[model samples]
Target: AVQIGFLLFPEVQQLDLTGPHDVLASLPDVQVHLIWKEPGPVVASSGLVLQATTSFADCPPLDVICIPGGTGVGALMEDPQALAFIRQQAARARYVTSVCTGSLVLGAAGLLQGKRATTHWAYHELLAPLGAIPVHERVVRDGNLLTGTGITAGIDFALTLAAELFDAATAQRVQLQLEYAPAPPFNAGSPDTAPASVVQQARQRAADSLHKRREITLRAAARLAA
Candidate 1:
């Protein structure tokens, strides 16, 4: 059986983890394990608390490792234990995947250095600081590393990974089971489609938070290498 491990931290975007979880868990011969620093309740960005199945220290080796992103990432990037755990797992996992700002965590682990990746559209530019070539697509795959953009993109990333790991037919079956079809009510999903005013407002709102988070992550990276 393929063992898939998902790392959950406080304030993680639940959808970023759940979306892929749903798809990956549905595979025929796979075991899904939700892991955290400890086996306990994990609070999400949306204020929901979830119980993890295993602690990072006790979890078995993973075939695939997924890291989801949200405001929690800002804090986790500053966490030595969390970054070290991810780096260790990625070293052995057949595939390492992340969703949304989760790429920030991977980049922090030094996994994206010299690789092409995509993350939350709002922070795609930030990857360059970690030596990653950021792409604007919904999903970017560089060998064993796969990254998706924003929250909803996790589903796309999982399906893509499924295709790579299994086959197109297997991925199609999973998509069909999930009734995966894009039917956005509006065309404002991307910056190119959103009105300039909306984009500007969003950017302004995130600017301060991003700056603070970057400083925290940089400090964490330095500490990890020290």
Candidate 2:
């Protein structure tokens, strides 16, 4: 069986976990695991309550491990238990992956140093502080590391991962099965595509969160360097 584990933490962007979960779970012979510090209810950024199926101590060796990002990522970066679990699992896992700011978690676990990776556009600068060569892309693959940008990009990352684990035919079949074509109403998903005014407003809204995340990331990076 292809054992896949996704880290479930408080304030995670629900879509980041669910989007990839939906896609990856559809594959045959795959076991999806929701893992956290404990097996219980965890609230997401959207106020959705998700249950973790496995605790860090109970999680088995996984073939693939993923981290989904959200506002809680800043706190997670400094979480020793979470970081240690990621390091342990990643050392044996075939694929180490993340969506959005989850890449920051991987960076904190000392997994992304000198590797090409990506994260939410507003926090792209934060990756450099954590020793990752930030790439602006929907999905980036550097060897065993696969990272997705923003929240919606998790689906793309999953499909790409499916192709890697199995084959293009399998990935395409899964994509077809899910009817995964996307037609967004507006072209404002990225700063480059959005109107300058819209981008400005969006960036302004996230400035405070970004500032805090940057500081937390610097602290984590310093610890990693030490």
Candidate 3:
């Protein structure tokens, strides 16, 4: 049986975690966990409620541990309890992965050292100083480490992971079941395709959060360096 867990917490980007949760859980013979430091009701950045079913202490060894990202990720990047849980499970998991800014959490746990990884565009540069080779891609995989860019990319990342865990055929069938076709009708998905003003505004909006995240990441990197 395939066991995958999504680390949940207050203020996480719901789609970044739950999007993948929806896809991965649909795989045959698989189990997914909404994991956190405690068993309780957690609120997403969107203010939607999510139930965290297991605490760090109660979590069993998982085949994959997925961390999601948002403003809360800033605090989790330095959280010893969260990092330790990730570190411990990563030691035995088949894949170490993240969505969006969650890659920073993995970096803080010292799991992305010298690895090629990807994260939300706003925080990708911070990965380099954390000893991760940040790549700009929808999904990136370096051995057992895999990551996705921003929020919606989680679905692509999950499908890619499904292919890795089982086979291309299996993933294709899963996609068929889910009607995974997309017709976005917009060229604004990436900075390169979006209008210059739009891209600039997007960057400006995330500037403050990225700045705070950088500070947390620097501190975490220093701890790892020591």
Give candidate 2 regions above 4 Å deviation: none
Best of the candidates, TM-score: 2
- lDDT by residue (77-154, candidate 3, tens digit) is 888999899999999999888888888889999998999988887677898988988788878889888888867777
The segments of candidate 3 whose C-alpha lies over 4 angstroms from its true place after superposition are: none
Which wins on lDDT, candidate 1 or candidate 2? 2
Ranking by lDDT: 2, 3, 1
Question: lDDT score, residue 144, model 1?
Answer: 89
lDDT score, candidate 1, position 155: 82
Candidate 2, residues 129-194, lDDT tens digits: the string is 888898998888999998988777778878878998899999999999988899889889989889
Identify the runs in model 1 with alpha carbons over 4 angstroms from their true place. Answer: 221-226
Better of 1 and 2 by TM-score: 2
- List the candidate numbers ranked by TM-score, top first: 2, 3, 1
For residues 104-142, could you state the per-residue lDDT of candidate 1 as single tens digits?
989888888899998887787778877789888888888
How much does candidate 1 score in TM-score? Answer: 0.94
